[model samples]
Target: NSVSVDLPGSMKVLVSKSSNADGKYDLIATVDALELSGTSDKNNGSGVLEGVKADASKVKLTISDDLGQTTLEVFKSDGSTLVSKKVTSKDKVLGDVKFNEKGEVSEKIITRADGTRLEYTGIKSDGSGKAKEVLKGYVLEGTLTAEKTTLVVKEGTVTLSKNISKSGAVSVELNDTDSSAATKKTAAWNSGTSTLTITVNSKKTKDLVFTSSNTITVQQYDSNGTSLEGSAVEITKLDEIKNALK
Candidate 1:
């Protein structure tokens, strides 16, 4: 049977198996105040989105559920996909996320759990895509991206790095070596010379204060990337510096 309705923007119904073997059917007396109820026999199911709108810039959703699996997909009106995520009884969760292209996902899920295996895309971490191992703690592996931030954990230590253009100071950790000196400058250290070069506005600015523990090196730069004439002193208390960054 076929039925039609008028006085609306647009309505698209794929299928409506309203009648059951017992001749049971559902109805909505009125949609104005909105109240409706219905039931299907066991093994039969129906679903819909109430108060839904169409003819908008928002994406359309397509959801499906079958015994052991359920899936949800988000798509533009033109049929281009925005993202899609699915769940299965045997798996954690699956997400088809778009990071770089129209319908394809640059990042994908490998193995998923509470904190077991999670994967995502990056600019370029030395390889086609860097594999960051460790979820409970932190692991830093890959080629550092220019003017970007990344964290590296190794040898039971965590360090943060911010490669920037501005010659300012900010409390940042770098290269498995971490620090929390408050300034906005971008600084890089050379252990060989025990020298740290700080930049602000892409210009070299000042001398850096250094505190070494033989295990790690922490440096402090001036906010303006200027001299460290009366800044922090030579320090040896590793825990004190670590606390500042945390």
Candidate 2:
């Protein structure tokens, strides 16, 4: 099951939080750049999530309103395909989504805003090819190359599981091509909710990683601090974090 956040593409959301009264949040705003900047945390300080800018017009998020599943997609500002992902609420995992230029559902992914992607290599017609993926620091998917027998990553990390406990700390540099691979590392935890952060010399890209050194802190305090406008990713990340920890 996948949930969708239906918003106009023209609207530029900051991915922040909003409140009606008494600091009580009613809904989660998928874009609230200002809120992330205004809010402060002891771990990483204020404006942590704010540093990363996500235009709602470029991204589409669908969540299972019934709390069963979620699907999130990031689009190109030029209206081209960037990345699309769907996770079932029951299993909380990827379904080998291939990247499609013609809109065919498959696998091609990246965490940063730039075109840098992490995809599976050599997916045979039988859906089984090789054990090789991408970098051990992160994740994504694609197809096998006819030239090579072994699967190879085009640009991103290879390790796919978000489970920090089982997967351990993945040493990776987010999006900066000028930076070194081991310059950064994002390690998540089980805090009863799910959250993620970007650290180090992060490379800047037009799609996901808009700014380098962007810190995306997803946590419970983030949801509580913002209104409905700021809680969408936080809530979804909570589920993701829970599943990873489990």
Candidate 3:
């Protein structure tokens, strides 16, 4: 049995029951920007779960942001948190919480806003694993492997395609309508050092050193190989670049 009700502010609620042996029931509430879903085995006379007494192990909750991000949380039999995962619109994992068979936190990994990643393996409630910063590289959409693909960057009206070969050799091509102008621009990436050298008209012009996944340290230089004063800048729109690849 199921029912749907329309609520104010463009929200909707749906209640449904499963025919399975577990006699599970679900309630889904939604709006334009967010959605929530919960499941339980016990319900009050009003066709809604008794929030205070529902079996925690049988209850589940899922949430979504309209922008294609989602989070799912599962509870243990004792009502303690069991697992949780957060994923981006591009199917990239942003965070994860895992539980061991004993219902304890076994591991946790999270990617921060500035692209710093922390991973804790064999973790415990008392903080035994010792969290550490981990290197998380970018992956291109539809690629078979991780961190062995391409990145597309845009600055104003210009677009740059950065391709990495299997052997870690990196090459960048400028894409623009002005054929002659595009031909005069070249870039080489040193994967060993995470450095990008940009040349214009066969003259070294700038160097973009990847300080982190979220930052690019730009150093402009003159034709005489002298660093230009006041030309250093940092690019911080790495999220945009990742989305472009997707």
Candidate 4:
């Protein structure tokens, strides 16, 4: 079976992935403006979808209407909701979605040929209908500043039988230092959080904690391949943190 979307809609058919798990080649809607307007009527049908393909990688739309044969791109993850149609040329842009290690929607980037980088994210909503802007930031390697940080503590529900070792690792992208102020004050930070337990340890260690505003610096390696700074995350364990010590 297949799916179809109107001018700004979607299709029922879903595209599957091919080889490149990281590459784009997923389900998509194909369109061709050159052909749609019947501009290239003689050579092609102007703009008609030829095929649809979707997979774990990316979504692509293949079109070959009257304007010869060309492929228009579509999105599978977010579809076109977050795409950027800044200009007429960008209409050729194929859509894309980015993922983090856990397969969570980390970032989504739009395709564009503008002089500047073309990418955007979508804001998803909850059942209540709250809106959120969205976009994908690549493996950002740089320095970021902490205008401010907030501490958080939560209670652990799990009860471990024995002690557990704890470790932490952090990832950060620094703010751009494009100008004098930016270059002079580009802040950099590294943080992480982990808790492990072993038999010898013999203690019900604690729980897991994750927060950008508040973090424990596990290890920091800068883009230039240099060790930056390392710090111990405060708030010992579930009990300790929840007790109000961050």
Candidate with best TM-score: 3
Candidate 3, residue 88: CA error in Å? 17
Candidate 1 local Cα displacement, residue 93, angstroms: 3.5
In what order do the candidates fall by TM-score, top score first? 3, 1, 2, 4
On residues 1-246, what C-alpha lDDT tens digit does candidate 2 reach at each position?
Answer: 212233322112232244334542232334433222222222111121222225642544443334534444445554456544444333433433554555444443323233223344334544443333333233233233333323222223322132112132222222223335544333333333332333333421111111122222332222232322323232122234223221
lDDT of each: 0.37, 0.32, 0.51, 0.28
- Between candidates 1 and 4, the one scoring higher on lDDT is 1
Q: Which whole-number lDDT from 0 to 100 does residue 159 have in model 2?
A: 24
lDDT of 1 by residue, 1-246 (tens): 322222111222222345666865332212333232333232222232222215422233222234323233344555455444333223443443443446454554434345433344553433244433223333334332333323333232334442222231222333433334433445566644545565545555543333222122334445554544445444334344344333
Across 1-246, the per-residue lDDT of candidate 3 in tens digits comes to 877754322345576744346687676665333455655453321122212123444333333333434444456665565644333332454677788866676776666555665555666555555344433443322121223335555554456665545464555555544446634556677766667776665666777766535355677677565565456566545564433222
Score residue 103 of candidate 2 by CA lDDT.
46
The parts of candidate 4 lying over 4 Å away from their true place are 1-45, 52-107, 111-115, 118-122, 126-246
lDDT for model 1: 0.37
- Models 1 onward score TM values of 0.32, 0.26, 0.37, 0.20
Candidate 2 clashes: the total is 42
36, model 1: CA deviation in Å?
15
Sort every candidate by lDDT, greatest first: 3, 1, 2, 4
Query: In candidate 3, which residue ranges exceed 4 Å CA deviation?
Result: 1-94, 97-151, 162-177, 181-183, 224-232, 236-246
